[PDB]
């Protein structure tokens, strides 16, 4: 109904304004921390190195910024556009995740990227639906074996359907939410909370880019980098189901 | 269909490797240059400041890089707010749309924790509103087309082709209103190039949301209504991106 959708608009609007109030409250008091840290670094350096004027240190920092902004990395193997990192980057497009922790610097890069996505995203959506159906099949089938037990226990066939759906997501959650977060904690030296934050920002395809796992391979652990790609694929497919149903839940409400 | 799933996987896989080759070809040289420039900057500074070891300069740069990466600005030493009510509103929008530009990061663990639940609840809620607006926008467009469609049918062009021509006009005007119009708008408003603007538009409407380009984010602009109003466009454009793709899919099926 047109009347109802107007209502929905207003609700959302309120969901946004409410969000805004909370993020402002939680983040505004720390807006300025990074400046402060940069200035602390400058002042410390001047005190240690009397041959340097503040203004000269200023130019250095500008020149460094320009280079970093072009893709330079502070060094003390790190190419973001070598074959493996470019592969990953292409993934971040067709998934629509779009971390963006590495920017395109060329107009050709941008131009090509437009067509790459227009063609790539729908193509990927198709494969995702495919994997979603095939993965759900495997899950529901396994759960079906557990269902056999409930039905013998004379638990009503209606509840058995429900227990399976809870199981369906709960087991997925374990494999695609919980398992990875515990993995990343140890591998990335993130905190548990940072890891779950990352996981969820990823599987929702929000893809902020403040945290990114799989851009480069890890020596002494080869299986890591692919398993992450494999994970993103399977998890995104799982998360589709999660999202559709929370939606049905909301429609019911 | 198990055979097709495997074929599709191999295809995508090739679409990625092909992407990787192209992005590396288009971006690696620029990046390799930047890395060089950073090292030139270092070497130049050492030659001018004998009180500084290479290794000490290395640490300074790592520290500066971390701060810039946290959103410190090289130009100033220290008014405008990234988390003012309007920018936070916008930020919330970037979540539920799953666009996720990420040009301003959350710094607090509370911010992250809240963000998780905000999205889980926000995205499906939005998807519902989007489907709604998609149907309603297509309806209004389809009704408008009808009157001009009357003219084509009188001109004795077959009903099968008139349907096709109308689609061309249907998308062409949508495109005009939601792709072309905004890109021309942003060119003038943001001081981007035409190519940068289309790049931004499309990165946005695909929900990739890299974050290299963000309308309104510019600090200098005195433009309060601007940034939420842009969201008005985002709403209308995304739904149309959606609804059209959906109907196309149904026609294909």
């Amino acid at each position: 109904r047109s009347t109802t959708l107007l209502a929905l608009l207003a609700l959302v609007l309120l969901y946004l304004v409410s969000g805004a109030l909370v993020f402002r409250a939680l983040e505004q008091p720390h807006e300025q921390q990074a400046q402060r840290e940069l200035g602390e670094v400058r002042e410390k350096f001047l005190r240690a190195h009397p041959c340097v004027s503040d203004q000269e240190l200023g130019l250095l920092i500008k020149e460094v910024a320009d280079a970093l902004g072009g893709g330079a990395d502070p060094e003390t193997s790190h190419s973001a556009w070598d074959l493996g990192s470019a592969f990953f980057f292409s993934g971040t497009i067709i998934t629509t995740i779009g971390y963006g922790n590495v920017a395109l610097r060329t107009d050709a890069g941008r131009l090509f990227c437009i067509f790459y996505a227009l063609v790539g995203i729908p193509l990927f959506g198709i494969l995702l639906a495919g994997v979603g159906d095939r993965l759900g099949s495997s899950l529901r089938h396994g759960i079906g074996h557990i269902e056999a037990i409930f039905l013998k226990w004379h638990v009503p066939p209606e509840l058995v359907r429900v227990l399976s759906a809870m199981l369906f997501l709960l087991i997925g959650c374990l494999l695609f939410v919980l398992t990875p977060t515990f993995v990343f904690c140890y591998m990335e030296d993130w905190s548990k909370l940072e890891a779950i934050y990352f996981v969820i920002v990823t599987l929702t395809t929000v893809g902020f880019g403040d945290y990114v796992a799989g851009a480069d391979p890890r020596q002494d652990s080869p299986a890591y980098q692919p398993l992450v790609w494999f994970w993103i694929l399977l998890g995104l497919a799982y998360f589709a189901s999660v999202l559709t149903t929370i939606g049905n839940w909301l429609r019911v409400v | 269909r198990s055979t097709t799933l495997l074929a599709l996987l191999a295809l995508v896989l090739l679409y990625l490797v092909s992407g990787a080759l192209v992005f590396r070809a288009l971006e690696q040289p620029h990046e390799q240059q930047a890395q060089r420039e950073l090292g030139e900057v270092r070497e130049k500074f050492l030659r001018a400041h004998p009180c500084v070891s290479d290794q000490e300069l290395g640490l300074l740069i790592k520290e500066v890089a971390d701060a810039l990466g946290g959103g410190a600005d090289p130009e100033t030493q220290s008014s405008h707010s990234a988390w003012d009510l309007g920018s936070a509103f916008f930020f919330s929008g970037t979540i539920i749309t799953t666009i996720g530009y990420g040009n301003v990061a959350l710094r607090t663990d509370a911010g992250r924790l809240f963000c998780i639940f905000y999205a889980l609840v926000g995205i499906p809620l939005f998807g519902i509103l989007l489907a709604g607006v998609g149907d309603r926008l297509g309806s209004s467009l389809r009704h408008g087309i009808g009157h001009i469609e009357a003219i084509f049918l009188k001109w004795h062009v077959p009903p099968e082709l008139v349907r096709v021509l109308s689609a061309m006009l249907f998308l062409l005007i949508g495109c005009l209103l939601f792709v072309l119009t905004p890109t021309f708008v942003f060119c003038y408003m943001e001081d981007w190039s035409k190519l940068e603007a289309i790049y931004f538009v499309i990165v946005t409407l695909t929900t990739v949301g890299f974050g290299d380009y963000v309308a309104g984010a510019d600090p200098r602009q005195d433009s309060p209504a601007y940034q939420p109003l842009v969201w008005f466009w985002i709403l209308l454009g995304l739904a149309y991106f959606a609804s059209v793709l959906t109907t196309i899919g149904n026609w294909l099926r």
Partner: antibody, heavy 116, light 107 residues
Framework: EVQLQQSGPELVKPGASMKTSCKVS????????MNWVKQRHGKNLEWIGLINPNTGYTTYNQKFKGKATLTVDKSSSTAYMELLSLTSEDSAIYYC?????????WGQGTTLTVSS | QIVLTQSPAIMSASPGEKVTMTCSASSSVSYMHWYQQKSGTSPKRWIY???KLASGVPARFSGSGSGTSYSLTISSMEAEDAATYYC?????????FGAGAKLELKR
């Protein structure tokens, strides 16, 4: 014993320019930033600019951008300041002083008098 | 660009008296430095980085403060302390000075 020895008082006509010096001893001239400061009689101190004796690099107070040129002679470890197009408001005491965050050593000052 | 205000610009103390002069900044700085000047002669670094004493300076002097508010204190005035004290900052280029606070002997 660090010491910055400034040259003597100078008296010049309005319009003319003037160059004054500061010879350092007791430390190595090229290791430290040199600044100049203006004190018009018994009033606020005003930073004019700095020079890096090692690199030649200079930066100035906006107030003094056109007015003052800083230079150094490395061999004689001496710093120079030229003031241009002098007017009456330039009459003051001028100091060379050392430092990149605090001014830890100062010359004894030199008095400029501008007058017809 | 950053402005430092020292107020009052004149004050007076008997010997033995405790003396406190303040410096308020137009916007926050990380450190404040102070000079002592006696008429006839150049300024001397007195206190730097807020609370560190230069070589010569006796212990009756101390400094403190933070952000936008800084102070110089004499626990117990002496006669040779009569002078003009200036604050200065260099957390932002260009460096800048307070307009000085003159401390005279009471009688």
């Amino acid at each position: 014993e660090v010491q910055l020895q400034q040259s003597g008082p100078e008296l010049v006509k309005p319009g003319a320019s003037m160059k004054t010096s500061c010879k350092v001893s007791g430390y190595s001239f090229t290791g430290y930033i040199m600044n100049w400061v203006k004190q018009r009689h018994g009033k606020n101190l005003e930073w004019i600019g700095l020079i890096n004796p090692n690199t030649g690099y200079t930066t100035y107070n906006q107030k003094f951008k056109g007015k003052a040129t800083l230079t150094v002679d490395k061999s004689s470890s001496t710093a120079y300041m030229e003031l241009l197009s002098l007017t009456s408001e330039d009459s003051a005491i001028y100091y060379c002083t050392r430092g990149n965050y605090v001014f830890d050593y100062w010359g004894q000052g030199t008095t400029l008098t501008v007058s017809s | 660009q950053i402005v430092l205000t020292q107020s009052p610009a004149i004050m007076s103390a008997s010997p033995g008296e405790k003396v406190t002069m303040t410096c308020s900044a137009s916007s926050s700085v990380s450190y404040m430095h102070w000079y002592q000047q006696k008429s006839g002669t150049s300024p001397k670094r007195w206190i730097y980085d807020t609370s560190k004493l230069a070589s010569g300076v006796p212990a009756r002097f101390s400094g403190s403060g933070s952000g936008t508010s800084y102070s110089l204190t004499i626990s117990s005035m002496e006669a040779e302390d009569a002078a003009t004290y200036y604050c200065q900052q260099w957390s932002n280029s260009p460096p800048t000075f307070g307009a000085g606070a003159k401390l005279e002997l009471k009688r």
